Amino acid sequence: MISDIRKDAEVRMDKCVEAFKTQISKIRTGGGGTEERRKDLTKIVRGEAEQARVAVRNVRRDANDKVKALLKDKEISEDDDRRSQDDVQKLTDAAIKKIEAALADKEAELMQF
Amino acid sequence: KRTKFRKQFRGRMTGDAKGGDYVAFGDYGLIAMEPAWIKSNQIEACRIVMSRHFRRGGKIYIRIFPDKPVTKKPAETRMGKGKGAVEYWVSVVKPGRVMFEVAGVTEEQAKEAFRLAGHKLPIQTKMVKREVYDEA
RNA sequence: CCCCCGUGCCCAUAGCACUGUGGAACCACCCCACCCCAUGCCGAACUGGGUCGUGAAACACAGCAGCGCCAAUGAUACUCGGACCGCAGGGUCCCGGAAAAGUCGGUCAGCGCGGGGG
RNA sequence: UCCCAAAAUGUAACGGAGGCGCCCAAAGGUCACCUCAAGACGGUUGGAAAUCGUCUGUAGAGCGCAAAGGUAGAAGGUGGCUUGACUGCGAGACUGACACGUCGAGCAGGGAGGAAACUCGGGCUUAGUGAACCGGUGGUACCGUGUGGAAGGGCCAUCGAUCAACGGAUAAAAGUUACCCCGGGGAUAACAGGCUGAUCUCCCCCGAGAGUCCAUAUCGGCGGGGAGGUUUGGCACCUCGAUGUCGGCUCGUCGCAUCCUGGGGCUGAAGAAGGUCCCAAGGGUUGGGCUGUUCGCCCAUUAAAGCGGCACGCGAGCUGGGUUCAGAACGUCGUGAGACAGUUCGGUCUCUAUCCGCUACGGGCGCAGGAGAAUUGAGGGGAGUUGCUCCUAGUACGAG
RNA sequence: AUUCCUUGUCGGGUAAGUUCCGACCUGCACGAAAGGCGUAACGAUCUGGGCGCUGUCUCAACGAGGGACUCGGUGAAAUU
RNA sequence: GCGACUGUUUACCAAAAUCACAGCACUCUGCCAACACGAACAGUGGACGUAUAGGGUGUGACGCCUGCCCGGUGCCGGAA
RNA sequence: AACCGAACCUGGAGAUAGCUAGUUCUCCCCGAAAUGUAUUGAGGUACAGCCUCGGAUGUUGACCAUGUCCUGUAGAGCACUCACAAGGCUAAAACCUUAUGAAACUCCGAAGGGGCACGCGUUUAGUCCGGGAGUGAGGCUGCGAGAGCUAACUUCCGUAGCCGAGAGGGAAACAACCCAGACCAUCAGCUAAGGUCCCUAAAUGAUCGCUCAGUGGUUAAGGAUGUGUCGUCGCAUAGACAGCCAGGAGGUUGGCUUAGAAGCAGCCACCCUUCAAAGAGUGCGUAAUAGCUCACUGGUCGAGUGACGAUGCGCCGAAAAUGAUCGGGGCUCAAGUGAUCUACCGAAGCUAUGGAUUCAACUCGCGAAGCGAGUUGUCUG
RNA sequence: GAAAGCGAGUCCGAAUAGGGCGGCAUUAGUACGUCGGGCUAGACUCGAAACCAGGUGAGCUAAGCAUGACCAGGUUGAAA
């Protein structure tokens, strides 16, 4: 059954990450950096990362209840609870790992000029 | 590369070779020296290697298609039922058969062709030539 | 000496398939069929009553090595047992046993009882 | 039912695939009779399949359902009659440890189908099943406690259990314990060790390609060969009549895959500041905020602010912040008691060293007179860090 | 403290805050009499900050007194 | 932050965010009360009380408050 | 009334205790099991398996042969089944050629194995009845498979040996491995394993070579013409590709595509001439050419060289934590190692002299139980 | 044999098939003893946590009740 939730989790997750990763490019007007006008712009970037974190947590606090309250109806025993956790972590941690990595490059451009 | 429809699991055993053929659909060949497990993730891996070296005129008759489905190690406790048969496929290669062979290329484009694609091989291999006749 | 009819052993080193020789005796077709008996529908089969003609066709003998079928010297796989090797995958040495396949070759039969004919 | 095997039998694994807890008023019985799958050429409200027909045809189809064996003289496809899908029985065998279980020639009674020899005691065989007890219902007039019956009992037959955790305790039975208690276990877990090493860490081989040019200055797809064992873990072998668990504070110390220094090579190295790889563990490697942390972020520095061992070094050294006793609270699960690698406030961890080892200090004897006292060095320990600045300089150097 | 998901995200005090106080809201699993939200005074309650002082600390040093050490007297234990 | 407050407790590991409380609420009981102790139509406690009195439950200064859902459960009522 | 999730005291029984611990005199004989089945069973117990005692039997046991039957691990293989390598060919299935895999494919198919009667070299068990048992997870190792990185001094079947309840010697130390199964006594001899420089015995013995690492003392992909030995390609009055000086010629004259890509970023194709002779180009450096070289030529040296292919030995690869080491010392004037031989050493094995014990039969004596005597074996430890 | 009951035979059954037994290699044995063992009792010995019955005391601590005891000093400042 984990092979079913894994997809539904990765698809929806990567679908968002791939989306925001493209939206952040719409913020960059050109060069970025015109006398002090560099940090104030970063404020807009903070929103992209903030909304990203939540989006990655939603799927975790949504797909989990779909299985937790499912294995209680006499269908799936234990030993799968933690198994499902380590499954969403490899997706959540990986996502955040890409976000911070992406922002590291974006910030290097918005401050470059 | 990949199968279409098979059973659940299979077996494993080291037996003698039943195909003492050196030349097959070409001129040169490639024979191993010691038994080894050739993973399906190697055939396609070396395929692109023999393609970037051959310019217009590079055909290969791969007949070492993996037919020995195995299991894969879990990630916690290996206690209970069977394992997952979803990972990779290998094929027992008894020293005496051919895994790689081409035709058309020159000697220099052959002695080095099979030379490059051989480092990822668990065992050592060699090349062959004419003087190979079995049946009609 | 031959040949035909049945019925056996044998159960493709006897089978199929190219072609031929055979109908006098035997053999089949064919003819007819109210009813015995009979077809999911037809008397093609089964079957009752029976010529000539015929023997492409079913049969019967015969030749030809196309294909089937059988198929050994040598030799390798494996190998009881005996003695070892490499971290291992796995591998060898000694004494016997020792087949698949494929090579040569060999065939399309051989052995009876019975009844009918020259 | 196969498969798994040390090849007759047999045989394990929460080992690899699949079926049963029926069905058949008759695919049963007996007797007659019919040559299947499938392709091909040619025709139909057909243009995939079937159907009709003719060739082919070791049967490749079928056999109610699972697989296998069996595979045509038929069990295979039809029809008549029929209902042995029988009572009384079994020589002698298969199989089982026991109780079951399977197969059976021949006997009899009476029947069924062929003309007959004959076949016939369910179904091509293998699953479609359940002891014993307790009770229902037909037949039989063996007991029936003074005799005579009867009640009740016995025997034939048969019915009832989804006893399914199916060789099966009661007619009938769920939870919880962090209030916990007793008997035992390292033939079973968590710490640690160990074996291991998939995962981790790291070294090496191949050269796709980036790198203007160029594969290896650097970086190295795809794939590979080993290493170390500090990580997840697997196995769980000493240790559950007790190997105290994280972390810190204290004390340290050892390895190199060397963070800083130290010498080197290559550079895509002008200098300068680097990279990288090689050699190299003498010595060194800061102070704080947050955190219970190891770990990590940040502040201010530095030659640098290394990685890992040592029972994740160190509690018969300390702390007790963390977690795995009691109370209490919250969310949440639970009808309840209660519950949670969920959080939360609280929470007694044990003056008196034997032996080894260790820091000091003495007492003996020996060192071939008995003394005083001055020394050699076998060997052994300690120490061994580094910045800045100026002098050569603003010189080699470089357009600057 | 209820929010698993990182320290959730801006903000506040700090040189620097996985904490704490304002807020946002996505409350894995707030909430109305297992009461909601709030509240002056009180609490050997818990949490965070500041003032002051300080051997808590950077490092301790010194002094003292009670053992510890030495001789006479009495002389135990767990363990084994 | 928790609780309102003083007060209590886990004599020998936890005094608190426990409990307790003043305050609010649902309900029960007019009889030899509900109720409780009792081998007892004995006795006694509820009370030499008597319903804004008595038991039960929960909740808990004081302040603004106290939503939707009785299907299931239990509770009273009905009744061919 | 100092350990209260139910006080304390006395009795109910010394509750039950399938769990634990302990169980006391000697010698002799035999000698287990950790398997199968069932189990509210899985450290428990039942039945059998295995042990012993004795009564009947008294060769049927046991291995070895022979003939006879049944399997269809190993292998193989295609025309069956599921997958599968290249082309044909057809409107892709099929059919063809070449080529395949396979625990759950199979028309083939062994070894060995199993039932049987039969006997000898053999041989000395076998069984039936009946008394009393214990064991009822077993451990390692090679082999044959599952699991599982064909990872565990991992687990689960089969099988053999050992352990378990067997010492002794060997492997430094070491249930497992190797040699061997210990009746007693012997300052007695021959061997097996394994060894024979010194720490312990026994050739620091022989012959032929391999080695030079100090390998022999935990590894591999992959590298190095390190040395030994086998076998293939071109030449010395062609007086050799490699060493020393010279030439290392031109033309012709478009690509895709650039500011350039008119020898060497990628994608084509790659004639001719003059000659003693010169490329259909194996590099370096530049933005393209220059410039350093390849093949070919002259000369003088030139009885030897250059390319791999196979194995015997070895080097690199090789990084660990309390101090290092093959057991140690050391060992190449080898005490390392491949082959050859012989001698010795060395177990409680075999042997010698003596003795004791268990079972049988053969000469005994006594009227008997019984004793002691000689003989073979045993004395299984 | 289930039993009626019959018997060197008796049950299955209106059949001559088998099971039980007799004859055949023919013990019929019994009582006392010693010794292996089995069963029933403490039943090899030692050890529970716990269960039940009766009894012991609130000179423990928990509380009620009757009756007495005690609270240096200082501060604050209610109603009336």
From Swiss-Prot, chain A:
- A single MF term (Gene Ontology): ribosomal large subunit binding
Modification N6-acetyllysine, positions: 90
**Gene3D superfamilies, per the entry:** 3.30.1360.40, Ribosome-recycling factor
InterPro entries recorded: Ribosome_recyc_fac (IPR002661), Ribosome_recyc_fac_dom (IPR023584), RRF_sf (IPR036191)
Instruction: State the superkingdom.
Output: Bacteria
Q: Where in the cell is it found?
A: Cytoplasm
GO biological-process terms attached to the record? cytoplasmic translational termination; translation
Show the GO cellular component annotation of the record. Answer: cytoplasm; cytosol
Q: Which UniProt keywords apply?
A: Acetylation, Cytoplasm, Protein biosynthesis
Q: Does the keyword tRNA processing apply?
A: no
Family per similarity comment: Belongs to the RRF family.
Concerning PANTHER family, the annotation shows: MITOCHONDRIAL RIBOSOME RECYCLING FACTOR PSEUDO 1 (PTHR20982:SF3), RIBOSOME RECYCLING FACTOR (PTHR20982)
What this protein is reported to do is described as: Responsible for the release of ribosomes from messenger RNA at the termination of protein biosynthesis. May increase the efficiency of translation by recycling ribosomes from one round of translation to another.
Name of this chain's protein:
Ribosome-recycling factor
Protein species of origin: Escherichia coli (strain K12)
Gene name of the record: frr
From Swiss-Prot, chain B:
The protein's superkingdom reads Bacteria
- Does the UniProt entry include the keyword Cell wall biogenesis/degradation? no
Q: Name one GO cellular component term.
A: cytosolic large ribosomal subunit
What are the recorded Gene Ontology BP terms?
translation
Under the subunit heading, UniProt states: Part of the 50S ribosomal subunit. Contacts the CTC protein (RL25).
Functional note: Binds the 5S and 23S rRNAs and is also seen to make contacts with the A and P site tRNAs. Interacts with A site tRNA mimics, and is probably one of the key factors, along with a helix of the 23S rRNA, in positioning tRNA stems in the peptidyl-transferase center.
> Known PANTHER family for this protein?
50S/60S RIBOSOMAL PROTEIN L16 (PTHR12220), LARGE RIBOSOMAL SUBUNIT PROTEIN UL16M (PTHR12220:SF13)
- Which Pfam families does the entry link to? Ribosomal_L16 (PF00252)
Annotated GO MF terms: rRNA binding; structural constituent of ribosome; tRNA binding
Which family would the database say this protein is a member of? Belongs to the universal ribosomal protein uL16 family.
- Name the UniProt key words of this record, in alphabetical order: Ribonucleoprotein, Ribosomal protein, RNA-binding, rRNA-binding, tRNA-binding
| Protein name per Swiss-Prot or TrEMBL | Large ribosomal subunit protein uL16
Native species of this protein? Deinococcus radiodurans (strain ATCC 13939 / DSM 20539 / JCM 16871 / CCUG 27074 / LMG 4051 / NBRC 15346 / NCIMB 9279 / VKM B-1422 / R1)
